[PDB]
């Protein structure tokens, strides 16, 4: 029970009036961001491979793993810290606002963040309240003001609050100074409808007048003040304690369904890498078991390397293959997954189909980390008053596209039951011939009578019936019996029976739903038998708890307030703009990053397979097949652009034919591209190709001469014939998967094949003084000086693209 | 907004190719039609090439070159008779091969000083540290440091033709011209300056296993040190455990007579290089070449097995998609 003083003067333990819609502060950014970075199995593996390389002495330097790691972690930290600095500016244009105050017989004008509990604020018509005021007087007599909390509890009507009879006659800011009162309130609670306080205005001689307060006097925060000149409140709750800010649930870490697949792919490539490094060490020491298979008198060991303990070289030999095959687990796919996530979130801001003339602004992007999971939603938990409403422009022809695409639209509101049921009847969510299963408080006026009907309409009424035949209707009173009272009775769990009628009905409508009961519905559905990607598109301050609880929460830039367009991930200034955000922007955003992660493991398993098969023809001595300038340039220079320019400006279904046709959305639904069927085709097509690059060059090198002058090649011409077949095969495997050939896909696909052929002809061809090796001097200009090496490179590029081509003739018919 | 450009609105003009099944059937046929005439053109070429490889590593009690698998007095000697039933027509190329010899070994491939073999005045005296074991002896820096240069192949293979008389006529082998033009005239250079090569190597020593220093490899000022063909050819690692390295070449005669007339030949070798310690073979290989290289039937039987699996898959996929 806090005691607040009227004029903040006598007749400090309170929070500060401030809004925090961001995640990181300035102190807990690194401790909190890094932890979010190491949820990726590749940032953890490469921090262990770097920590072992700094405590033991290995033939490799700690810069092979530390340099990439400390670049992926500072690239995804400048974007996560910049995208969250903009959320520090959205709250800056609201906290640093203007709100006047009767400080000392003078109408001071502080900011909306410098208000302290116990100072007489004043609000003007149409001005929302900055904090939880307590009406002390209204301009007019009768001490009554009209407030509309259409954003706090979905109710659109005008509520009428009362003043304090002891101060109805106080105005002009000069009498408010002669007011000595003590307000004993209740500690801030989220009930939103209860309140208990006391006022004990102290007169000069003696006055114990105690006009007890109530919910009729408290003027909440976020409720507009309509039809009144001005008022004179006395702040009591001051932000983060206001009843509006106690119904926020708390930010969490949102990661799409593709960021969870990159970790299921990184766990089968962590066993493909510990089986390579372990099959090459189990064999490297049965091979060396012969006395003349190590130290064969033509290469002898140094005195140092001869004394090393054999039990420590079995470990540094293993750890030396992992570092040789560690390209299999790409950490250059995180520098491209974030460069594409940041530069692709601009197509939602730049879209002109999201521009609202009468508010003069378009879509928003609060986070780019979920672009790819807009095209993967299964449930959409909308709001009624303000977002669906008289219906809006196309809030009924948009619910027909969300039902044709296979989505399930639930209307979670906070208004009346039937009044809401009407505006969902109106929106054509409950058609005329749709058997309504009403679980409201109008049919369940008991505690046990619910069970007598819960299974009376599922075990015998719903399954024994289809789509439009039945639709549900619930409340906030009844839904508390199914949730709270049903956490003990587990013989036949209510929540189990109930949660079967919801996944069997066309659409559901929940009325009188508190701000923290729309987050329990979004949580019940997030757990049932899978991981249904849930969306939540609201517009007020009661839809901020179901927007922080869904997989991707949209927010509407409405008129009431922007409390949901700040705690959301995106923000369209209309509900009808959701058909183009999911159907046309989530279908492209997903198919672009689902093909960038399929092609980033393929890309690198064709690279390191021809280098693991070499160890059988070397002495298992972990000798790289390729040059050293070719290993590092592959993932960054030779193969990095063609896939970037694809994941950014490639539309495999025209963007004008997936907005109209809404059934192409269920083609990709369920993580179609990153499943186990498409994964076993990119992994087996990369072990079939990586085996054709090597064993197609191993059979070509049985000639004793590959040119007309009878000259022999070394091991660096063997490695650039397997690297030239490799670059043309992984670059022409994307030129075959491309359906949108912009002028930027013509310049990076043929400009990356004309750069490997120009860099090679240039890197080799000069005696570089700064190098200590000069081993690739003319390995490329001579490799291409033989006719048998051309006919052999154009036959291994076709034997490798035969699967990808035969699949185009079979899969592309019927 | 006023940013409704073709790029920002995702409406850049594109190509959008529809790779259907009805315009890919003429592919499997245009391929199988230009791969069978190739696989057949480069498969008869790989057959007209004449080649003979005689093994002389001993390891056999009835092997002429077995009397010095472990000789008491060096140098050894051994003659081996082969028979050319069909004379060699063009200019032939004499090789030498080695099995179980891992020149592509991490601890071996990296055992050279590429800046020292390039005429660097400073590297000649203080060689690198990668050629460590063979980097210094007698407190002096080995001139060709490393293992790749210390284990140079040093057998002396000579050929003779047993003419109509019992006396054999030795065929002339051409030594110079067997190393990449680039890595002999550019990449392999002698030390910086001097008149005679015996000086440029002052503070250097000869490799441990060699008999004569690098400035006495050959009596040809352009084939003497660091540019010796036999040396430049050995220093190019093999990429596999069984390799061939060009040794000599037998220019074709100005007349029309063959380069190696059919008959009985003598291959008398000075057995110096021990290759049995590690179960390695050692052979000689004569051969003629063609635009394609040597005798390898992989490209021949690979262009037909890929140009004739298409011509078929192009038909089946034209009879199954022909029902409709
Ligand atoms: C110039 C010659 C160099 C010769 C070097 C010879 C000596 C090498 C010694 C080797 C020891 C280590 C040296 C330092 C290593 C640097 C590593 C580095 O900078 O990583 C930066 C990252 C990651 O790289 P990675 O190759 O994917 O390796 C990851 C792997 N897991 C690993 O173990 O390490 O990579 C990325 O961050 C990916 C960036 C993707 C975005 C695309 C950028 C485009 C760049 C420009 C492309 C030009 C293309 C031209 C096109 C022509 C016009 C069309
Ligand atoms: C059989 C053998 O090892 N030695 C003979 C040798 O006496 C003679 C020579 C020329 O015909 O052919 C061989
Ligand atoms: C590897 C081998 O066969 N051992 C000998 C070695 O003892 C001898 O010193 C060298 C010439 O000096 O030739 C070789
Ligand atoms: C140059 C010569 O005639 N004899 C050497 C011999 O000392 C050495 O042992 C062998 C390689 O080990 O190469 C030969
Ligand atoms: C070739 O080898 C034979 C083996 O009898 C030996 O006389 C000599 O080294 C060579 N013979 C001639 C005639 O040059
Ligand atoms: O037998 C092993 C040989 O090692 C090197 C050689 O120069 C001699 O010192 C010695 O005879
Ligand atoms: Mg609302």
What torsion do the CA atoms of A123, A124, A128, A130 make, to the nearest 10 degrees?
A: -20
Residue of B nearest to A623 (CA): B106
Report residue A688: phi and psi, to 5°: -80, -35
Taking the C-alpha atoms of residue A387 and residue B137, their distance in angstroms, rounded to an integer, is: 87
Cβ neighbourhood burial of A343 (10 Å; 0-12, 13-18, 19+): middle
Question: What number of CA atoms fall less than 13 Å from residue B199's CA on the CB side?
Answer: 5
DSSP per-residue codes, B210-234: -SS-GGGS-S-TTSSSS--HHHHHH
Q: Taking CB atoms and an 8 Å limit, are B10 and A717 in contact across chains?
A: no
Whether A741 and chain B come into contact, CB under 8 Å, resolves to yes
Q: Among residues B212, B240, B238, B295, which one has the least CA distance to residue B44?
A: B295
Q: B7-42 in b/e burial notation, b at 16+ Cβ within 10 A?
A: ebebebebeeeeeeeeebbeebeebbeebbebbeeb
**Is ligand 2 within 6 A of the CB of residue B81?**
yes
Taking the C-alpha atoms of residue A728 and residue B30, their distance in angstroms, rounded to an integer, is: 21
B324 domain-assigned:
no
Cβ neighbourhood burial of A176 (10 Å; 0-12, 13-18, 19+): buried
Q: Among residues B236, B259, B260, which one has the least CA distance to residue B246?
A: B236
**Same domain for B255 and B303?**
no
Q: Categorise residue A774: left if φ over 0, alpha if ψ from -120 to 50, beta otherwise.
A: left
Which DSSP symbol is given to A490?
T
Q: What is the CA radius of gyration of chain A?
A: 34
Q: Are A606 and A693 in contact (CB under 8 A)?
A: yes
B223 domain-assigned:
yes
Beta strands of A531-626 (E only): which ranges?
534-538, 552-556, 570-572
Structure tokens at A475: 């409340």
As beta bridge partners, residue B269 has B78, B157
Taking the C-alpha atoms of residue A757 and residue A751, their distance in angstroms, rounded to an integer, is: 10
Residues with CB under 5 A from ligand 7 (ion): A 385-386, 539-540
Question: What number of CA atoms fall less than 13 Å from residue A114's CA on the CB side?
Answer: 11
**Same domain for B38 and B186?**
no
**Same domain for B282 and B302?**
no
Taking the C-alpha atoms of residue A604 and residue A611, their distance in angstroms, rounded to an integer, is: 11
As beta bridge partners, residue A146 has A160, A226
Q: Tell me which ligand sits closest to the C-alpha of residue B78.
A: 5
As beta bridge partners, residue A556 has A572
DSSP per-residue codes, A637-668: IISSHHHHTHHHH--SS-TTTTTT-TTGGGTS
Using DSSP, state whether A717 is helix, strand or coil.
Answer: helix
**Same domain for B44 and B138?**
no
End-to-end CA distance of chain A: 73
DSSP per-residue codes, A201-256: ---SS---------TTTEE-SS-EEES-SBB-EE--B-SSSSTTTTS---------
Residues 6+ apart with CB under 8 A from A241: A14, A15, A188
User: Between the CA of residue A651 and those of A237, A582, A764, what are the distances in Å?
Assistant: 51, 15, 39
Q: Taking CB atoms and an 8 Å limit, are A618 and B104 in contact across chains?
A: yes
End-to-end CA distance of chain B: 50
As beta bridge partners, residue A474 has A510
As beta bridge partners, residue A219 has A133
As beta bridge partners, residue B146 has none
Using DSSP, state whether B33 is helix, strand or coil.
Answer: helix
Taking the C-alpha atoms of residue B228 and residue A767, their distance in angstroms, rounded to an integer, is: 20
**Same domain for B144 and B111?**
yes
Whether A786 and chain B come into contact, CB under 8 Å, resolves to yes
Structure tokens at A813: 């018919």
- The secondary structure element, H or E, covering residue A688 is helix A676-697
Structure tokens at B167: 């006396």
**Same domain for B300 and B275?**
no
Q: Are B241 and A617 in contact (CB under 8 A)?
A: yes
Q: Beta strands A159-162 and A107-110: pairing type?
A: unpaired
Helical pair A721-731 and A753-763, crossing angle rounded to 10 deg = 160
Helical pair A803-810 and A676-697, crossing angle rounded to 10 deg = 140
Domain that includes residue B199, residue range: 60-289
Using DSSP, state whether A740 is helix, strand or coil.
Answer: coil
Q: Taking CB atoms and an 8 Å limit, are A618 and B16 in contact across chains?
A: no
Structure tokens at B75: 């140098």
Q: Beta strands B156-162 and B263-270: pairing type?
A: antiparallel
Structure tokens at A103: 């400080």
B69 domain-assigned:
yes
- The secondary structure element, H or E, covering residue B52 is strand B51-55
Q: Among residues B129, B166, B158, which one has the least CA distance to residue B145?
A: B129
Helices (H) and strands (E) in chain B, counts: 10, 10
Q: Are A176 and A252 in contact (CB under 8 A)?
A: no
Report residue B81: phi and psi, to 5°: -100, 125
| Alpha helices in chain B, H assignment, sequence order | 25-34, 36-39, 41-48, 106-109, 147-150, 182-185, 197-200, 229-234, 298-307, 310-319
The CATH number assigned to the domain holding A559 equals: 3.40.50.1000
**Is ligand 1 within 6 A of the CB of residue A637?**
yes
Structure tokens at A230: 């001005």
As beta bridge partners, residue A138 has A231
Taking the C-alpha atoms of residue A111 and residue A699, their distance in angstroms, rounded to an integer, is: 79
**Same domain for B179 and B109?**
yes
Whether A252 and chain B come into contact, CB under 8 Å, resolves to no
B160 domain-assigned:
yes
Taking the C-alpha atoms of residue A115 and residue B318, their distance in angstroms, rounded to an integer, is: 81
Q: Which of residues 336-395 of A touch B (CB under 8 A)?
A: 346-347, 350-352, 355, 362
User: Between the CA of residue B69 and those of B54, B58, B211, B272, what are the distances in Å?
Assistant: 17, 6, 20, 10
The total of other beta-carbon atoms located within 10 Å of residue A436's CB is 15
Structure tokens at A657: 């034919």
Which DSSP symbol is given to A128?
B
Position of tokens 């369940």? A444
**Same domain for B264 and B297?**
no
B297 domain-assigned:
yes
Report residue A510: phi and psi, to 5°: -120, 125
Distance B274 CA to ligand 6 centre (A): 14
Q: Taking CB atoms and an 8 Å limit, are A787 and B292 in contact across chains?
A: yes
Structure tokens at B24: 């890919």
Using DSSP, state whether A470 is helix, strand or coil.
Answer: strand
Q: What is the CA radius of gyration of chain B?
A: 28
Q: Are A583 and A565 in contact (CB under 8 A)?
A: no
B125 domain-assigned:
yes
Q: Are A2 and A184 in contact (CB under 8 A)?
A: yes
Residues 6+ apart with CB under 8 A from A212: A196, A197, A198, A199
Using an 8 Å CB-CB cutoff, list chain B residues near A744.
12
Number of domains comprising chain B: 2
As beta bridge partners, residue B141 has B136
Which DSSP symbol is given to A664?
G
Atom of ligand 3 nearest to the CA of B151: 1
Position of tokens 């807009």? A374
Structure tokens at A341: 């996530």
Domain that includes residue A498, residue range: 364-387+390-582
User: Between the CA of residue A682 and those of A666, A674, A676, A735, what are the distances in Å?
Assistant: 23, 10, 10, 16
**Same domain for B243 and B301?**
no
Q: What angle do CA A774, A779, A781 make, to 5 degrees?
A: 120
Q: Tell me which ligand sits closest to the C-alpha of residue B167.
A: 5
Q: Beta strands A408-412 and A508-510: pairing type?
A: parallel
Report residue A111: phi and psi, to 5°: -100, 165
Q: Taking CB atoms and an 8 Å limit, are B106 and A617 in contact across chains?
A: no
Taking the C-alpha atoms of residue B229 and residue A721, their distance in angstroms, rounded to an integer, is: 25
Distance B152 CA to ligand 4 centre (A): 9
Q: Is the peptide bond before A694 cis (omega within 30 degrees of 0)?
A: no
Q: Are A549 and A344 in contact (CB under 8 A)?
A: no
Q: Among residues A716, A722, A647, A729, which one has the least CA distance to residue A685?
A: A729
B316 domain-assigned:
no
User: Between the CA of residue B209 and those of A127, A301, B42, B113, B151, what are the distances in Å?
Assistant: 97, 16, 43, 17, 7
Question: What number of CA atoms fall less than 13 Å from residue A432's CA on the CB side?
Answer: 0
Cβ neighbourhood burial of B300 (10 Å; 0-12, 13-18, 19+): buried
A383 is catalytic: yes
Using DSSP, state whether A321 is helix, strand or coil.
Answer: helix
**Is ligand 2 within 6 A of the CB of residue B161?**
no
Taking the C-alpha atoms of residue A473 and residue A416, their distance in angstroms, rounded to an integer, is: 12
Q: Are A788 and B299 in contact (CB under 8 A)?
A: yes
A-to-B residue pairs, Cβ atoms closer than 8 angstroms = 225
Q: Beta strands A144-148 and A224-226: pairing type?
A: antiparallel
What torsion do the CA atoms of A674, A680, A686, A691 make, to the nearest 10 degrees?
A: 170
Q: A396-412 in b/e burial notation, b at 16+ Cβ within 10 A?
A: bebbbbbbebebbbbbb
Q: Are A694 and A715 in contact (CB under 8 A)?
A: no
DSSP per-residue codes, B56-81: ----STT-GGGTTSS-SSSS--EEEE
Residues 6+ apart with CB under 8 A from B214: B143, B144, B201, B206, B207, B225, B226, B228, B231
Q: Which residues line ligand 3 (CB under 6 A)?
A: A 297; B 209, 274
Kindly state the greatest CA–CA separation across chain A. Answer: 121
């Amino acid at each position: 029970t806090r005691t607040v003083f009227v004029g903040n003067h006598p007749v400090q333990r309170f929070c500060d009036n401030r809004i925090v819609s961001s995640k990181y502060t300035l102190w807990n950014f690194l401790p909190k961001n890094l932890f979010e970075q190491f949820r990726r199995i590749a940032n953890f593996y490469f921090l262990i491979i770097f920590l072992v390389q700094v405590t033991v002495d290995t033939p490799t330097s700690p810069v092979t793993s530390g340099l990439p790691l400390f670049f992926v972690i500072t690239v995804t930290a400048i974007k996560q810290g910049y995208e969250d600095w903009l959320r520090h500016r959205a709250d800056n244009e609201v906290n640093k606002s203007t709100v006047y105050i009767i400080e000392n017989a003078k109408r001071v004008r502080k900011e909306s963040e410098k208000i302290k509990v116990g100072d007489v604020v004043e609000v003007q018509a149409d001005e929302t309240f900055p904090c939880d005021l307590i009406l002390l007087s209204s301009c007019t007599t009768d001490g009554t003001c009209y407030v509309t909390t259409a954003s706090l509890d979905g109710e659109s009507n005008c509520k009428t609050h009362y003043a304090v009879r002891d101060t109805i006659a106080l105005c002009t800011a000069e009498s408010i100074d002669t007011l000595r009162a003590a307000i004993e309130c209740e500690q801030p609670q989220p009930d939103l409808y209860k309140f208990v306080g006391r006022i004990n205005i102290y007169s000069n001689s003696l006055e114990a007048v105690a006009r007890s307060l109530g919910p009729e006097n408290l003027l909440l925060k976020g409720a507009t003040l309509k039809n009144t000149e001005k008022i004179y409140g006395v702040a009591v709750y001051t932000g983060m304690e206001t009843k509006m800010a106690l119904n926020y649930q708390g930010k969490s870490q949102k990661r799409s369904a593709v960021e969870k697949s990159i970790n299921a792919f990184l766990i089968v490539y962590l066993f493909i890498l510990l089986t390579k490094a372990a099959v090459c060490t189990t064999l490297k020491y049965v091979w060396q078991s012969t006395p003349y298979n190590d130290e064969p008198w033509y290469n002898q060991k140094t005195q140092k390397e001869r004394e090393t303990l054999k039990v420590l070289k079995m470990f540094t030999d293993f750890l030396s293959f992992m570092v040789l095959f560690n390209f299999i687990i790409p950490v250059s796919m995180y520098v491209t997954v974030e460069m594409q996530k940041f530069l692709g979130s601009f197509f939602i801001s730049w879209d002109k189909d999201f521009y609202d003339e009468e508010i003069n602004e378009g879509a928003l992007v609060n986070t780019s980390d979920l672009n790819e999971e807009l095209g993967q939603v299964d449930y959409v938990f909308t709001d009624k008053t303000g977002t669906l409403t008289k219906l809006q422009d196309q809030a009924a022809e948009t619910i027909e596209a969300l039902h044709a695409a296979g989505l399930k639209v639930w209307v979670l509101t906070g208004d009346k039951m039937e009044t809401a049921k009407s505006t969902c009847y109106a929106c054509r969510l409950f058609q005329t011939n749709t058997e309504l299963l009403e679980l409201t408080t109008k049919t369940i006026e008991e505690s046990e009578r619910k069970e007598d009907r819960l299974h009376e309409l599922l075990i015998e009424y719903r399954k024994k019936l289809e789509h439009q035949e039945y639709g549900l209707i619930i409340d906030g009173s009844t839904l508390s019996l199914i949730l709270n009272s049903s956490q003990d009775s587990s013989s036949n769990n209510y929540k189990s029976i109930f949660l079967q009628i919801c996944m069997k009905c066309t659409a559901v409508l929940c009325c009188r739903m508190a701000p923290l009961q729309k987050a329990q519905i979004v949580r019940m559905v997030k757990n049932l038998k899978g991981s249904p990607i849930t969306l939540s598109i609201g517009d007020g301050a009661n839809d901020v708890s179901m927007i922080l609880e869904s997989h991707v929460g949209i927010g509407i830039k409405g008129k009431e307030g922007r409390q949901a367009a700040r705690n959301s991930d995106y923000s369209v200034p209309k509900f009808k703009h959701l058909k183009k955000l999911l159907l046309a922007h989530g279908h492209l955003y997903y198919v672009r990053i689902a093909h960038l992660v399929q092609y980033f493991f393929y890309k690198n398993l064709c690279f390191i397979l021809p280098q693991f098969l070499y160890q059988f023809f070397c002495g298992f001595s972990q000798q790289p097949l390729y040059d050293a300038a070719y290993l590092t340039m592959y993932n960054i220079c030779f193969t990095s652009l063609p896939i970037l320019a694809y994941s950014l400006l490639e539309q495999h279904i025209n963007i004008d034919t997936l907005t109209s046709d809404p059934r192409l959305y269920m083609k990709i639904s369920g993580n179609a591209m990153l499943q186990l069927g498409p994964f076993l085709y990119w992994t087996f097509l990369a072990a079939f190709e990586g085996t054709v690059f090597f064993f197609g060059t191993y059979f070509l090198f049985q000639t004793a001469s590959l040119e007309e002058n009878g000259k022999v090649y070394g091991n660096w011409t063997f490695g650039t014939i397997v690297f030239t077949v490799l670059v043309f095969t992984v670059t022409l495997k994307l030129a075959l998967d491309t359906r949108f050939w912009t002028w930027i896909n013509h310049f990076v696909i043929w400009g990356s094949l004309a750069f490997y052929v120009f860099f090679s002809f240039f890197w080799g061809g000069i005696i570089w003084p700064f190098l200590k090796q000069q081993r690739m001097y003319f390995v490329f200009a001579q490799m291409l000086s033989s006719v048998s090496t051309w006919l052999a490179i154009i036959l291994l590029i076709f034997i490798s693209l035969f699967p990808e081509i035969l699949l185009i003739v079979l899969k592309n018919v019927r | 907004r006023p940013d409704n450009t073709a790029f920002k609105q995702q409406r850049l003009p594109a190509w959008q190719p529809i790779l259907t099944a009805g315009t890919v059937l003429p592919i499997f046929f245009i391929i199988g039609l230009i791969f069978i005439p190739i696989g057949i053109g480069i498969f008869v070429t790989s057959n007209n090439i004449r080649e003979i490889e005689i093994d002389y590593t001993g390891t056999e009690p009835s092997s002429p070159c077995n009397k010095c698998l472990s000789p008491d007095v060096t140098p050894c000697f051994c003659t081996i008779n082969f028979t050319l039933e069909k004379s060699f027509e063009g200019n032939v190329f004499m090789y030498y091969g080695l099995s179980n010899f891992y020149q592509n070994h991490r601890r071996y491939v990296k055992s050279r000083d590429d800046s020292q073999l390039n005429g660097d005045s400073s590297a000649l005296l203080n060689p690198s540290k990668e050629c460590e074991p063979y980097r210094r002896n007698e407190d002096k820096p080995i001139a060709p440091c490393g293992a790749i240069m210390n284990s140079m192949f040093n057998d002396t293979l000579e050929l003779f033709l047993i003419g109509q008389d019992s006396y054999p006529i030795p065929i002339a082998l051409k030594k110079k011209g067997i190393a990449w033009w680039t890595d002999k005239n550019v990449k392999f250079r002698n030390p910086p300056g001097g008149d005679n090569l015996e000086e440029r190597f002052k503070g250097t020593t000869k490799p441990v296993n060699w008999l004569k220093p690098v400035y006495m490899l050959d009596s040809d000022p352009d084939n003497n040190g660091f540019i010796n063909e036999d040396f430049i050819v050995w220093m190019r690692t093999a990429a596999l455990p069984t390799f061939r390295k060009l040794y000599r070449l037998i220019e074709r005669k100005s007349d029309l007579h063959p380069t190696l007339p059919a008959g009985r030949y003598w291959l008398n070798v000075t057995y110096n290089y021990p290759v049995h310690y590690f179960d390695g073979r050692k052979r000689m290989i004569l051969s003629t070449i063609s635009w394609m290289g040597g005798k390898n039937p992989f490209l021949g039987i690979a262009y037909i097995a890929v140009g004739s699996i298409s011509f078929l898959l192009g038909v089946v996929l034209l009879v199954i998609n022909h029902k409709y």
